[PDB]
Design a protein around this ligand. Sequence first.
Ligand SMILES: [Cl-]
Ligand SMILES: [Cl-]
Ligand SMILES: [Cl-]
Length: 62
Amino acid sequence: KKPIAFKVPPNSKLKVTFFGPYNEVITNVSIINQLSTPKCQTITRYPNYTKYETEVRSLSSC
Ligand SMILES: [Cl-]
Ligand SMILES: [Cl-]
Ligand SMILES: [Cl-]
């Protein structure tokens, strides 16, 4: 299980969803970036997975 690297856009939360063979959600992890510049972060712990997808959400007020 090598690290997987992700670029988190400025002022955002990146949500990574791991999926299995039947398109089922295994788990989710997330990474915040409060900075005004993009930032790379690695995920080193994760379950066995078939694929992942990512989503970006804003850290602005709700
Ligand atoms: Cl970016
Ligand atoms: Cl970061
Ligand atoms: Cl991690």
